[PDB]
From Swiss-Prot, chain A:
The RNAP catalytic core consists of 2 alpha, 1 beta, 1 beta' and 1 omega subunit. When a sigma factor is associated with the core the holoenzyme is formed, which can initiate transcription. The rRNA transcription and antitermination complex (rrnTAC) consists of RNAP, NusA, NusB, NusE (rpsJ), NusG, SubB, ribosomal protein S4, DNA and precursor rRNA; S4 is more flexible than other subunits. This is DNA-directed RNA polymerase subunit beta'. The chain holds residues 504 to 553 of 1407 of the full protein. Disulfide bonds: none annotated. The lineage of its organism: Bacteria, Pseudomonadati, Pseudomonadota, Gammaproteobacteria, Enterobacterales. DNA-dependent RNA polymerase (RNAP) catalyzes the transcription of DNA into RNA using the four ribonucleoside triphosphates as substrates.
Curated annotation (Swiss-Prot), chain B:
Acetylated on several lysine residues in the presence of glucose. This is DNA-directed RNA polymerase subunit beta. The gene is rpoB. Co-administration of salinamide and rifampicin or salinamide and myxopyronin suppresses the emergence of resistance to both antibiotics. The chain holds residues 697 to 796 of 1342 of the full protein. It comes from the Bacteria.
UniProtKB/Swiss-Prot annotation, chain D:
Keywords: Acetylation, ADP-ribosylation, DNA-directed RNA polymerase, Nucleotidyltransferase, Transcription, Transferase. Changing R179C: In rpoA101; temperature-sensitive. Its EC number is 2.7.7.6. SUPFAM superfamilies: C-terminal domain of RNA polymerase alpha subunit, Insert subdomain of RNA polymerase alpha subunit, RBP11-like subunits of RNA polymerase. This is DNA-directed RNA polymerase subunit alpha. The modification N6-acetyllysine is found at K269, K270. It comes from Escherichia coli (strain K12). Residues 221-301 are annotated as: Alpha C-terminal domain (alpha-CTD).
Length: 50, 100, 51, 301, 100, 50, 142, 92
């Protein structure tokens, strides 16, 4: 119950947030942009995943 | 106390038997953790049997569920009390209310 | 009253030279979070460097 | 070249709580030092709370004393909330005597030459008769954190209260933008604490910074004993001085203390210097104790 | 014979009755632990007779019943507390001891 | 066949610990699961911890 | 006076020539002794030995002196002024008592300690026996 | 750690002087000495115990209380003062 709420709030999206439509060189700097305070947890973004 | 009650706390506290309800109103004479002495007002008082009442409170003793049925005095000294009024709070009471 | 438990890093269990896993023990109750948060904000926010 | 924080203004707006001020700070360090010093100040600061109470005519803490309208348990809670400063002692024993109708305030304690009550209007209990008097001894000591009664009394007349050795109540920092000094993107850290009067605020922020900088200080069979005494690099006289006491291995020299060797005149003055030169390598004469000969690494196979 | 509820008994230690008074019952106010002795109680065991071996040990005590044992009340294992109230009821005819 | 009855009243003081049951007045039960320190609590922009 | 100890006084297989009275004193302390770490300091070896009684109730002492040693037993000339100067200097006047442990129903009060005391008495007797000779040309077997 | 440490280098006898009534014993033990116009225990230490035993103002239980007080050896140790003051007890 708690963990599906944490995931459903995490992997979602909104039509404008901090860092809308910026491009990221990996998931590591995705978490670094979430922690430093430069993007939001749900902000649509092109990443490069492997 | 309950910050958000229903006003039904005073009926459950007074109409049970854990508080020490005053029988005849008057002026308190001696408060103690053991006893409480009420001096009965003259417009409530018998002609004979001169009369100042003594409430012997029930201090720390065993309940049936191994809790601690205490009574604490909640009145000051020299304080007026009316007929039908709390003098000693009981277990889970406060000023005559019901604080669980 | 001032002398706490003072730690020292017990191991640096490292993978290849640009990655590491550094432990610390024993810390007084509640100080793991304040040193982790202080070092995390300093490293992740303000370091000198060139790019 | 980071700008360093220096205390600038200590606004003692009331008697309990104050607003210390740190300036300047580069961006990011505001929340870092704010959360860090908040967590140190709430965690572990030296307070001066109370531990033991001995009311005179009271056996156990669940009894009642003749002539006081509160129980002995309520007197223990009201003494647990006592806000008191001590100056030059570990623990101290305060004495209370009061007789007569009315309250027993906290200013009725016979104060010693260093104990200082910081709130003398604090009520303890109410005496309620003309000849009914309490007379208690209070034990107040230093500490850190919350030390309850269940963890830590020998006669039956002592009463143990819990010990909340903690002077502060509410620490709130509010970061905000900084003016001139001719550079923007600088921050001010304004910390409003909430003391109970037992701790000076600059002393509190100084002890918190000392504790945190102490925490970052963390990173910011002997072959000589198994060998014979004659195998040492020194002369034969240095070996013979130890060998006069029927010693053949340096492990036997390490088994005996240097004081025990100095209490025997078989060793000489130059032999003492040779022993010091040998012990400078710290392989022998380090004040150790063996089983007889063998360590675990020295095992029989 | 009947039982004995006086002071200690045998098989005790300074830790066996350092909180009891001179008549077995724990004090009022003694803060005890889980597994101390509150009431010391000894009962009988073997009657036998007069053994030749311990002739000076079975006669000096003056125990012509004897071989008493150990059945003292103990705090059940786990609970602390502070003894606040002790009641002693005596069936009439029996000698009241000093604490009764 | 009883000589004397001794009754002794122990008075334990049980505080609180992880494992007790607390509940409101609406059916919201619960085993209290962790007794946190003061500092870890979510506080607001006045200073008071919840 | 149940005359319980009286008959036990003259047991007397191996305790006939030995200090009978002393043995009873030791036995009394073993019963009242053993597990006795309360009171004030310890027990009380000394006790008013009353042959007729048999069970000499453990009596304490005050030991009148003139110094400030052994707190329990401390009397002075100024402290003996309340008794109309009846106490002298260096007197072992007793002014306190103690307690024992049931009777013979409580075996081990003096049983392990009773035997322990008996053992101490036996050791003293053996010392006296070896003092009788005081070194002689005697033999023996390993 | 070097950055965070450089951001913090701008921060980092009493028993005789006490009254007889202040003793832990009961008021009778203090009043026995106070009957001879004594208010401080230093005055009790100035006089000998034999001199106090030669006066019937002290009682039998008061003698035991005096012995219990003298067991700590802070008072009634047979001393002699100038009148009140020792050198450590100096006027400032």
């Amino acid at each position: 119950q708690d963990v599906v709420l944490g995931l459903y709030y995490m992997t979602r999206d909104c039509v404008n947030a901090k860092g809308e439509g910026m491009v990221l060189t990996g998931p590591k700097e995705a978490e670094r942009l979430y922690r430093s305070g430069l993007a939001s947890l749900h902000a649509r973004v092109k990443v490069r995943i492997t | 106390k309950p910050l958000v009650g229903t006003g039904m706390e005073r009926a459950v506290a007074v109409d049970s038997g854990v508080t020490a309800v005053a029988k005849r109103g008057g002026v308190v004479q001696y408060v103690d953790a053991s006893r409480i002495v009420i001096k009965v007002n003259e417009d409530e008082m018998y002609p004979g049997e001169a009369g100042i009442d003594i409430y012997n409170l029930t201090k720390y003793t065993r309940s049936n569920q191994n809790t601690c049925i205490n009574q604490m005095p909640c009145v000051s000294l020299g304080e007026p009390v009316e007929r039908g009024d709390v003098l000693a709070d009981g277990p889970s009471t406060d000023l005559g209310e019901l604080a669980l | 009253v001032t002398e706490f438990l003072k730690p020292r890093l017990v191991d640096i269990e490292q993978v290849s030279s640009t990655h590491a896993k550094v432990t610390l023990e024993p810390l007084e109750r509640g100080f793991g979070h304040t040193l982790g948060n202080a070092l995390r904000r300093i490293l992740l926010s303000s370091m000198p460097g060139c790019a | 070249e980071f700008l360093k924080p220096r205390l600038v203004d200590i606004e003692q707006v009331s008697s309990t709580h104050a607003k210390v001020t740190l300036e300047p700070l580069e961006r990011g360090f505001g929340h870092t030092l704010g959360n860090a010093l908040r967590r140190i100040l709430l965690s572990s600061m030296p307070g001066c709370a109370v531990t033991e109470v001995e009311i005179d005519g009271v056996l156990h803490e669940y009894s009642t004393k003749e002539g006081v309208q509160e129980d002995i348990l309520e007197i223990l809670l009201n003494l647990k909330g006592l806000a008191v400063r001590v100056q030059g002692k570990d623990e101290v024993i305060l004495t209370l005597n009061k007789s007569g109708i009315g309250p027993v305030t906290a200013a009725d304690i016979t104060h010693d030459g260093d104990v200082e009550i910081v709130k003398p209007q604090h009520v303890i209990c109410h005496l309620t008769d003309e000849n009914a008097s309490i007379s208690m001894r209070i034990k107040v000591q230093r500490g850190r954190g919350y030390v309850p009664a269940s963890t830590r009394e020998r006669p039956i007349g002592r009463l143990l209260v819990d010990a909340c050795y903690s002077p502060v109540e509410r620490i709130a920092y509010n970061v905000e933008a900084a003016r001139v000094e001719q550079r923007t993107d600088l921050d001010k850290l304004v910390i409003e604490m909430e003391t109970n009067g037992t701790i000076d605020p600059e002393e509190a922020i100084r002890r918190a910074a000392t504790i945190l900088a102490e925490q970052l200080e963390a990173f910011v069979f002997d072959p000589i004993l198994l060998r014979p005494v004659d195998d040492l690099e020194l002369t034969v006289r240095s070996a013979n001085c130890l060998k006069a006491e029927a010693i053949h291995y340096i492990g036997d020299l390490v088994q005996r203390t240097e004081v025990e060797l100095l209490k025997t005149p078989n060793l000489g003055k130059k032999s003492l210097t040779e022993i010091k030169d040998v012990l400078a390598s710290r392989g022998l004469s380090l004040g150790m104790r063996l089983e007889n000969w063998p360590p675990a690494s020295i095992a029989d196979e | 014979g009947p039982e004995e509820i006086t002071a200690d008994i045998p098989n005790v230690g300074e830790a066996a009755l350092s909180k009891l008074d001179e008549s077995g019952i724990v004090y009022i106010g003694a803060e005890v632990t889980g597994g101390d002795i509150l009431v010391g109680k000894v009962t009988p065991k073997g009657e036998t007779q007069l053994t030749p071996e311990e002739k000076l040990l079975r006669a000096i005590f003056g125990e012509k019943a004897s071989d008493v044992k150990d059945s003292s009340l103990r705090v059940p294992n786990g609970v602390s507390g502070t003894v606040i109230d002790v009641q002693v009821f005596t069936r009439d005819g029996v000698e009241k001891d000093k604490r009764a | 066949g009883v000589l004397k009855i001794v009754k002794v009243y122990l008075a334990v003081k049980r505080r609180i610990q992880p494992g007790d049951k607390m509940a409101g007045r609406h059916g919201n039960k619960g085993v209290i699961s962790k007794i946190n320190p003061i500092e870890d609590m979510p506080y607001d922009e006045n200073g008071t911890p919840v | 006076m149940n005359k319980e100890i009286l008959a036990v006084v003259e047991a007397v297989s191996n305790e006939k020539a030995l200090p009978r009275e002393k043995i009873f004193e030791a036995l009394e302390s073993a019963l009242a002794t053993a597990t006795k770490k309360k009171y004030e300091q310890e027990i009380d070896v000394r006790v008013q030995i009353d042959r007729k009684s048999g069970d000499f109730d453990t009596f304490r002492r005050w030991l009148v002196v003139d110094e400030v040693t052994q707190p329990t037993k401390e009397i002075t000339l100024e402290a003996a002024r309340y008794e109309d100067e009846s106490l002298n200097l260096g007197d072992y006047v007793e002014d306190q008592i103690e307690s024992v442990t049931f009777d013979r129903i409580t075996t081990q009060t003096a049983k392990q300690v009773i035997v322990q005391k008996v053992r101490e008495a036996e050791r003293a007797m053996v010392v006296d026996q070896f003092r009788e000779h005081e070194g002689e040309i005697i033999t023996g077997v390993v």
